[model samples]
Target: TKKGVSAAAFSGVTAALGDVGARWFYTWAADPQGITAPAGTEFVPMIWGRDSVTADQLQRAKAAGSTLLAFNEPDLAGQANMSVETALDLWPQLQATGMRLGAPAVAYGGDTPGGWLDRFMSGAAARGYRVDFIPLHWYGGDFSAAATGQLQSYLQAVYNRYHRPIWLTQYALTDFTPRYPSAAEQADFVSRSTAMLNGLSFVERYAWFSLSTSTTPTGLYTGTTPNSSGVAYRAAG
Candidate 1:
C-alpha cells in the first residue's frame, strides 16, 4: 500500500495531500489516465492557502471524497503579506465540516530572527482552529555546514513554544542533478538526513519531496533520467 503503480494501485494510506492553486493537478492525478481514487476511499487534501480557497471550493472538495484537508503556508498579519484575520475567519468554515487544519512554517538558520515564527504560532493559536500538526520542508540547498544544527535548534524552539508534533513533509538530498553528486554521495545524504531526524524529538512523520517531476531536480522519479540521489534516499528510507 505504501507504494504501487497507477492502474494496479490499490487502496492505501497516501501521504500525497492535494494542493490549492493547483486543482487541475489533483484532477489529473486521480483521473482514468492517472491513479484513480479507489472506491470508498479518499486522499488527504492539504489545502494550501486560505486566501485562495473559497467556501464553494471546499464544499466541492468534500463532495469529491476529500475527507481530510490541511491549510498550509499561513502567515502572520502584516509581517509576510498574509491576512491573519482573514485566514482565521476561514477556520469555522473548515471546522464545520470537521476537516483538519495544518500550518507550515519556515525554520530560520540563525541568520534571520525567529520573531516571525512566534507571531505566527500565537496568531494561529488565538484563532482557535483545531490544528492537527505542523508541516515543514527541509531543502538540502537551504542548509550550510551549520544549517542542520541551526535548523534542529529552531525546530526545538518551536516545539517548546507550541508543544506540538511536527511532520517533515518535504525533504531531498540534492536538487536532482545527474552531474551533481555520485551514488555514494547520494547514499550519504540520505543517511545523514535520517540521522538528523532521528536526533530530533518532535518529528513524528517524514516524506520525500516528490516521486517525479518533469523540470525540477527535486523530483525523485523523472521521465527519462531518474535521480540517483532520490532513488538512493528512497531505498534507504
Candidate 2:
C-alpha cells in the first residue's frame, strides 16, 4: 500500500494516523515535533528550504529516514521560494547527507519545459548531483468523476518528463473558490484517487493533503476519529 499522510504535530494525530493505516508521513519539517508516530509508520523528513539545510537539520534528517524531501514548493513565493540558481548552489549540502533525495516539490508546472524543476534538474545533471525521485503537490478545484484521471495524467506527464519515481507528497480535491466538497464528495475522491494511485507503478507514494484539520475540507480526520474520508482512505490500498 502506498497510502500516506501529510501531517503536523497535532493532538491525537499519532493514533489517528495509525488508525487510518497510513504507511508513512512527513511533517514538512526536519523535526518530528513531539508526535511519535505509530510503530512501523515511516516518518520521512524534509529539508524544507535553504535555511533548513543547516548542519543540525541535516543531521536530524539523516537520522530520521533513508529518504529526504527537498524544498517544499520552491516555485511558490508563499512556500520555500528559491530560484533555480539558489537551489542549485545549495544542492551539494543536501547531497552530502548521502540519503536518497527527492527533487524540490513544485506547487505546479513540474512538467513544464524550462520551469523551476526543469531548470533545477538540468543544473543537477550538469553538475553531477543526484536526485532519486520527483516530488509534487497538486490541488484541484474540480471535484468530479474525471478528477482521478486528471491527477493520473498529471503524474504521467511528470514521469515522462523526469523518468523518475514520483511521490505525490501533497494532493487533494480542494477548491479555493470558497466551495468545500462535502464529506461524501471527499470520501469518493479518496476512494477513487487512492485506487488510481496504487495502480500507477511510477507513483512511489501518495498522501492526502492532510491527516487532520480544523476547517480544511481535505483532511482525513476530525480529531482522533476517522471522518468519512478517513474511512475511505483506511480501506484503500
Candidate 3:
C-alpha cells in the first residue's frame, strides 16, 4: 500500500499508525524518541530546518531509515524559512548522509516556473546533488466532491513540472471559512481522495496531515480510536 502518516511525537503514535494500516511514518523532527514502530512499518525521519542539522539529528536520521526528507516548507516564512541559495549551501550535508533525498518541500506553487522549488531544483541540477523524489503538501478549500479532482490536479502539475515520483507527505481539508470542515465532510473527502490517489501511478506514497488528535480538524485518530476520517484512511490503499 502507498499509505503512510505524517505524525508528531506522541504516545501510541506508532500503534495508531499500525491500526490505520500505514506502511511508513515520519515525525517533523529527526529523532523518533525511541518509539517502537509496529512490525514492518518504516519510520522515515526529517531534517526539518537549519536548526535541525546538528550532529545528533543527522546521526539519528541516518540510523532511522534509507530516505531523508529535506527542509519542511522553506518557502514559508513561518516554517523552515530559508532562501534557495542557503538550501543549496546546506544540500551537501543532507547528501552526505547517503540516504535517498527528497527535495525541500515548498508551501505552494511548486509547478510554477521560477518558483522556490523550481529554483531549488535548478540549483540542485547545477550542483549535481541527488534529489530522489518530490514531497508535497496540500489542503483543499473546496469541501465538495470536486475536491478530489482539484487535489489530483495539483499533484499532477507538480509531477509534470519535476518529472519525479511524488510523496504526498501532508494533505487534508481545511477551508477555515470562519468554520472548519465538518467531521463528516472530512471523512467523505478522505474516502474519495484516497481512492483517487490510489489510481495515480506517479504518486508513490501519501500520508494524512496527521495520525491524529481530537483538537485538529485534520486529525485521523482520537486517542487509539479511529475517527471518521481515520476509518476511511485505514481501508484505503
Candidate 4:
C-alpha cells in the first residue's frame, strides 16, 4: 500500500515503500523533479483541477512507466461536472501514449454526480480505454468509525451503481481526538480503524491518511512521540 506523503518529499519515501510497491499521486503542487524514485517505480499522476496536461508530457510519463494517470476535482459550469464528451476528447490522446485514465469522484461535501461520469464511463466502454480506477477521499472527525462506515457505504453504492473498481485515496480519523494522540491510543485507533476500512469488500486499495506528522493528524509511523498505533498497525499489517 502507498502511504500518503508530501509530493515534495515523495522521492525520499520511495525506498521506504519499496520500488515496485510504492505508488505516488502527482498532485497539482507536486514537483516532478522532487520524485527521484529509481527506474520502474510506479507513479499515478492525477490531472484534475489543473488547466490541462499536454500530450508530450503524457508521452514522457509513459516512457518512464507511470502506472496510471488520474483527473480530480472537476467542475461543471455552475455546478460539479464530469462530462462524457470532455472525457471522450481526453482519453484517446492519453491512451495513444499508452496510459490509462482515472478520476476522483467526490460524493462527500455536498457534491452530486454529474453527466461527466456517465460520459466518461460510456466513452471508456466504447473506446476500450480502461477506466483504471475511481478514487475518493473521506474525512470523518468525531464520528470516526460511523462516518467512515457511512462513507464506505456510499462508495460501495457508487461502485455497484457504476460497476467500477475503487481506490480509497484518503482517509483520516480526525475530529474528536487530539491532533497528537498518545502512542497507545494512536496504535489502538490506527489498528482498529484500518481493520474496519480494510475489511470492506468494495475497497480495492487504500492509502493511509499520511506518511508524516506535518500535514494531517493521521500519520501512523513517526510523530513527536513514537506513535504506538502506527507501530502496531504496521506490525499487524
Candidate 5:
C-alpha cells in the first residue's frame, strides 16, 4: 500500500474524519449527495443496496468522483441482498460509468469457498467482467494477540484466491460478541492493524469500519470528535 493511503467508512452526513489524514472516503451512498470532505480528500461513492441505485445514480457518482464501490453487503440478507445473477446482470451498467470500480464488499466470509465473493468472482471471470480490485469488511470479535495475524491471514487468502489488489473498505476490532474488549485493546488493534495494512503490498487502500456520529466503544468518533482509536489512526495515517 502507498504511504498514508487510507479512508473512512463514513456513514453519517459529516466528513470530519477527512481531517484525520485519509486520502479517500465513502459515504455508503450511490452519490456523494451532500457529503463534504477536506479540500483534497477523494470521495468514493458506493451502491449501498438494491433498493433503487439506478444507472443515473452511478453516472452521477462517476461524474462526481474518480472511483466507486459496488454494493454495500450483498452477502448479508438484511443488507444489499443482491444475488450473484442480479449483481452480474447489473455489472455492465456500472462499468459503463467509466470510473475505477471496486468489487462488492461482502460483510464477512470473504475467504470462504462457495461464498458470495468467490461465486461472484467466478461468475464474473466466466463472463469477462472487470473487477478492478477487491473490497472487504471485517469486524473482529477477538481482540487477543492473534487477532492481527488472523486478519492478515484472511487478507492473504483473499489476495491469493484472486491475485488482485485489495481495498479494505471497513474493519474494526469489535463484532458485538459477548466479550467486550477494553478501549486500550481497541486502540492497540488500531495501531497494529494500521501498520499491517500500510505494510501490505497488495492493499491499495483501506478504511476504518466507521467514522461514526456517536462514539461508542466500537466506533471511532464522538459526534465529530475522535476517540482513542481515532487518535491512533490520526497519528498513524
Candidate 6:
C-alpha cells in the first residue's frame, strides 16, 4: 500500500517521486543501480522477459529486492507479446526466487475470459502455481469530470474479476484517442484518480506512467518543480 512511479533512470526524477512519498519504484528491467531509490524507499526489479533475464540477474534481484514485477504488457503485440503458455512455463523459476511476485501486466481487457491476464491466472491456478498480486496498466482519453467515474469503473471491474490485491502499475490520460485533454483536465484526472486509488483498500499500490518533468500533458516535473498534475499527485501522497 504505497504511492509510486514507473520511472526511467532520469537524473533527479526518482528522488522527486520519493519526496512525494513514493515508497517503491521499478526500472522496467533487472538493473539494480540504474535509478537509485530515494532515502527510505525501495527499488523493485522486473524480469521484463524470459530471454532478457539471466541467472545472475535473478540472483541480484532476490538478494535485497523486496519484490519483483514480471513482464511488461505481454498482451500487446507491440510490447512483450508473451503467450500464456510461455509465461506460465517461465514463471516457476521466478517464483522459486522467493521475492514477492506480481503478475505480468496486460495492456488491456484484463477482466475478459480469454484475455491475457485472465487466461494466465486461470492456467496458473490449474497448475497450482501462485501469483501474489495483479499488476495493471490503463490509459484513457476521457478528461471530463465523468472521466473519473469511467476510470473507477475500469479498476473496480478488474478487482471484481480477480479477487487478488492490485497494483495499478501505470495509468494516465493519454493523447492516443481522438481528443487531447487539456492540461486542466489532466490535472483533474490526477486529483480524482489519486483520490480513488488511495481510498480503495484492495489497491495495494500504484505508479504514474513515466516520471518526467518536461514532457507536456503527462510529465510531472519542470526543472525540479511539479507541474499541475504532479502537484496534485504530491499532495495526494
Better of 4 and 5 by lDDT: 5
lDDT of 5 by residue, 1-237 (tens): 232222333454344555467676676776555656665567777877775467678767877777778998898887898898888888888888877888899989888999899998888899999999989988788888677888899999999998889988877776643356788898898888888888888988888766663423466676557778778877766
TM-score of each: 0.62, 0.95, 0.94, 0.65, 0.89, 0.91
Report, for every candidate in turn, its global Cα lDDT versus the true structure.
0.46, 0.87, 0.86, 0.52, 0.76, 0.79
Model 1: residues with Cα > 4 Å off, grouped in runs:
1-42, 60-81, 105-116, 140-150, 173-187, 198-201
lDDT per residue (tens digit) for residues 8-126 in model 6: 76677656766666777777877645666656667877888766556787887787577888889998777788899999999888887888989998878887888888899989888
Tens digits of lDDT, candidate 4, 123-154: 66777766766776655554433554566565
lDDT of 1 by residue, 132-224 (tens): 666655555533344456456656766677777775555554432323344455445655665676667677655554545432345444442
TM-score (C-alpha, index-matched) for candidate 2: 0.95
Rank by TM-score, highest first: 2, 3, 6, 5, 4, 1
* Model 3 lDDT on a 0 to 1 scale: 0.86
Question: Number of clashing residue pairs in every model?
Answer: 2, 0, 0, 8, 0, 1
Give stretches of model 6 more than 4 Å off: 175-179, 213-217
Q: What is the per-residue lDDT of model 3 for residues 1-237, given as tens digits with 9 covering 90 to 100?
A: 799988766667767877898888887878666667786678888999998877788988999888999999998888999999999999998998899999988868788899898899998988898889999988788888899999999999998887889999988887534346788888999999999999999998999888877435578887788888899999986
Point out the worst 10-residue segment of candidate 4 by lDDT.
22-31
- Best-performing candidate as measured by lDDT: 2
Give me the runs in candidate 5 sitting further than 4 Å from their true place: 1-15, 176-179, 213-217
Span of ten consecutive residues with least summed lDDT in model 2 = 174-183
Cα deviation in Å at residue 27, candidate 3? 0.6
C-alpha displacement of 171 in model 6, angstroms? Answer: 0.5
Residue 126 CA error for candidate 5 (Å)? 0.6
